[PDB]
Curated annotation (Swiss-Prot):
Keywords: Disulfide bond, Glycoprotein, Hydrolase, Immunoglobulin domain, Membrane, NAD, Receptor, Repeat, Signal, Transmembrane, Transmembrane helix. GO terms for cellular component: cell surface; glutamatergic synapse; plasma membrane. Its main location: membrane. The chain holds residues 400 to 558 of 686 of the full protein. Detected at low levels in fetal and adult brain, in particular in the frontal lobe, temporal lobe and cerebellum. Detected at very low levels in skin, liver, fetal ovary and in placenta. The keyword ATP-binding does not apply. This is X-linked interleukin-1 receptor accessory protein-like 2. Belongs to the interleukin-1 receptor family. One of its GO terms (biological process) is regulation of presynapse assembly.
């Protein structure tokens, strides 16, 4: 366990700017610089290679938490699919070997998407739901941040 949490998010090229800004820079920056947590971010710390899947698996095993940022882009690309594609990660999620922190940034209005995400929720044993209200939640020392920090290790 070398990392406090594994950050899972999706970025799609050019639909709300505040959501993307919170998911890509504010969330990691506040978790690492202000609170001192150590996060593994694939798009920052891992270079894609032929061992990409095995590398991601190993990094998840070395992470004390799994943060999933539920943005519209994440739903579009089904950014959670990786954790279901690899058997080891799937077993870790369903058997409760790693705690998952699901950050709800949008409402699952879509029927099919809502059903799929519900099936994902039931597939996780240790699941913590935190709603991101918006600009109020991004403010430092807000209810959102206290909740998230409590769900974090140490």
């Amino acid at each position: 366990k070398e990392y406090d949490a594994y950050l899972s998010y999706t970025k799609v090229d050019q639909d709300n700017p505040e959501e993307e800004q919170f998911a890509l820079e504010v969330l990691p920056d506040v978790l690492e610089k202000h609170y001192g947590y150590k996060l593994f971010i694939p798009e920052r710390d891992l270079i894609p290679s032929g061992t990409y899947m095995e590398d991601l698996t190993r990094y998840v095993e070395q992470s004390r938490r799994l943060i999933i940022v539920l943005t519209p882009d994440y739903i579009l690309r089904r950014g959670w699919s990786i954790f279901e594609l690899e058997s080891r990660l799937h077993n870790m999620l369903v058997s409760g070997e790693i705690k998952v922190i699901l950050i709800e940034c949008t409402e699952l209005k879509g029927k099919v998407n809502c059903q799929e995400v519900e099936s994902l929720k039931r597939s996780i044993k240790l699941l913590s739901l935190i709603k991101w209200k918006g600009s109020k939640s991004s403010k430092l020392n807000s209810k959102f941040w206290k909740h998230l920090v409590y769900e974090m290790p140490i």
